[PDB]
Design a binder for this molecule. Structure first.
Ligand code: FES
Ligand code: FES
Ligand code: FES
Lengths: 320, 332, 322
């Protein structure tokens, strides 16, 4: 596959991690993701340097991940800290590869490329996920399609182009009938404007803005929800979906939490998950013939994000 | 893959189609087969020209199939007839391929190859399925084997279906049509078939004929008659046995029975609608599906089949099919 | 795939075979295994010479395997003995390949390569399996890993490694010990201070026989209370294999309760937690091969490394011939 490795991707949501490691594949790389007894998240290559057993099937022993096959022990940095055989010796060849991980904005970000180039300044800005003004709920979903098809889906219903960031803004005075959603509709009564924005950040992290407000008031003074919609490639033809909603209205609604923690309700439904997986199963045919997609007006935002990913995939491929 | 695309194939039975589209793959081509408001059947490539969503998961909107992804609308010809986006424009690139589809003899025929060569006069004659002189029942079956294995099985020496237990032989070969004939005067095993025997009582003649038409469409003739009565004035059933490749290693089987006996017998309809009784026994599906899993081994070693006496008709259908494979492989 | 075809491998346990044929694949070769009316075991290529049907889905007709498609009949040599078609003629083109098979030591051995080199004298010695002095129990397992990984797993006086011709032995005596020399099942023999042994023998390609022993003080190794475990692997595909496991013990011969706990034989030929490691190692093969990733060997690996490289040398010899 052709992946963009020198970039931050979400590998998990913080609640998924524990002292029991989680095995998850990121850009065709099996990682063992666990949280150390002092709370710091580690990401080790899920292939023991000895005879390749899966570290993610082990447990922590004195805060060290102990391989379930023969008991080599590893720290968050990948250094072998205990060898229970023979002279107990730990040459450098017993170290497992370690990945940069930064926990920020209720997200576990990982750098799968050159670990020396990992720069926390490049992590996309998702502060609303930790903002006490917002109520943030969400979850995880696995999808059997290449990540770019869900990037299209999400970049879909003014387009500003920046460096490693793209914005697709739509302001809707009144709409086709009423430009009010059921959750927004109960807020006020006087005539309203609505917004439907989404921001794309380098590789495949996205944040939308769904808003309704009386008359023509500050966009930020509206009743709104910011959607976390982040994709991380799993294999060339599969990916992980991290979705979440940060709402500023009816914050302490235990009922609203239920519908928004649903897979079909916050991200793509059953017919919407079926569309991307179904498109993916049609890839071999469209490629075998000369079948290229037919663009419409509503595709400008998606096409520009697609071209940014294409540039990045070619630029890294040029390196190797 | 290796298919003979310039030929007519059955893609569905009429009763499978309605205004809710059916997704079916024919010779590695995903089709959406649906019936328009006036009942006329359309056959579109199941890949929307926009972002490749499956049209078969859509519905009709004012009689037009609307893609469930972004709402483009198509007519029976694949023409884009509504664009709900932007200036609404409908350039030619928003057309989806349409395949020649002809509903005839209670079968839904499709031409999966070069549409310029699709000639409805070439569709094999399965008239007995609409002949009010006959009672016609049948159904559908899917099998995990290359279709030629089920064509071999059906062209096999005096081999009938389970519900059909019991001059001599003759194989006539023509252009894209083969007939393998058997007349059994009086017999030695049995001349009355279990389902037939309730016709008359005195000693009889028996027939077991089968017709093959270009690429995998077959119609057999299982017959019983007293003494020496006209072959066509006999008690008989015309069996519809049509195979359509799905993938290189799987296929669709459309089986049917056109009988002139027990026309108003619903008990008889039940068994003849049975896929193991009429088309393929469970032990035969296991053999053919098992042979398919052996294809990689026999090809990797040099293993060619050793033919017997009971194989004359099938080997000829096999060689006719192969020539057609060559005609297409040469063109491109 | 790269297999060692000029070698004996177990294809089954005798109780798996009967007059009902068994389909099993050995080194990418589909076999039909059945036992003839006189008890003699035959091994035919599971591909009928007519139209490639599974012979293994057939039945015996007068001791001859009858193909379930069209009824051809085969004897133990693969010879077609009945053709129910036409003039009944049976040209040689209707014979199916037959494989050398030798039933020995309650094992079904097969030579999947060149039949001209098949020498029953090269079958490894597993006599304890038929020794009336021993009580033998075991079974079968299929595992989704290349067989070398379960040879690695199993190859893992103090610890001494003996190397012979097509034979490697890894011996361990634990004199008295410091952790424990008493095993849970063994402890109910003697009680005053004890020695323990854990040896394992590997014979060419992938047949292994271990020795688990416990005995008081310093008594003869052959006079200990012990079990000789059968651990034989046979490749199925590039990435799957058959596991034949067994226990031949000299203690509690007539104990049917004892038969039960050793038939929970996850303990010697680890097959539940141990199936999980090798299948997981196998699923990582594409990554470790795609990068230049080689295993880092330790002190506990001398036996495994020598057996692995002998398996490797034999693979090259055959790839070299062709
Ligand atoms: S083999 Fe994984 S730690 Fe010894
Ligand atoms: S795929 Fe976009 S309109 Fe059908
Ligand atoms: S395939 Fe075995 S006899 Fe026809």
């Amino acid at each position: 596959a052709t992946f963009v490795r020198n970039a931050w991707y979400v590998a998990a949501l913080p609640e998924e991690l524990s002292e029991k490691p989680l095995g998850r594949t990121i850009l065709d790389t099996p990682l063992a993701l666990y949280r150390q007894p002092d709370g710091v998240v580690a990401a080790l290559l899920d292939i023991c340097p000895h005879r390749f057993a899966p570290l993610s099937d082990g447990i922590l022993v004195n805060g060290h991940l102990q391989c379930p096959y023969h008991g080599l022990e590893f720290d968050g940095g990948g250094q072998c800290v205990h060898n229970p055989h023979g002279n107990g010796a730990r040459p450098a060849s017993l170290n497992v590869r370690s990945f940069p991980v930064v926990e920020r904005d209720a997200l576990i970000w990982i750098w799968p490329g050159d670990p020396a180039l990992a720069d926390p300044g490049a992590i996309p800005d998702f502060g609303c996920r930790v903002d006490p003004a917002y109520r943030t709920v969400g979850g995880y979903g696995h999808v059997d399609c290449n990540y770019k098809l869900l990037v299209d889906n999400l970049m879909d219903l003014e387009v500003i182009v920046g460096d490693g960031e793209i914005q697709a803004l739509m302001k809707i005075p009144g709409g086709t009938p009423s430009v009010l959603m059921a959750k927004f509709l109960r807020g006020a009564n006087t005539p309203v404007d609505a917004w439907n924005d989404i921001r794309w950040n380098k590789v495949s992290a996205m944040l939308n803005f769904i808003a309704v407000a009386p008359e023509g008031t500050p966009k930020e003074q509206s009743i709104h929800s910011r959607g976390t919609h982040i994709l991380t490639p799993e294999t060339e033809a599969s990916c992980h979906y991290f979705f979440g909603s940060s709402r500023n209205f009816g914050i302490d609604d235990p009922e609203m939490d239920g519908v928004l923690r649903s897979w079909q309700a916050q991200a793509l439904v059953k017919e919407d998950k079926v569309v991307v997986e179904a498109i993916e199963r049609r890839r071999a045919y469209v490629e075998a013939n000369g079948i290229r997609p037919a663009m419409l007006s509503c595709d400008e935002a998606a096409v520009r994000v697609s071209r940014e990913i294409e540039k990045l995939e070619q630029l890294e491929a040029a390196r190797l």
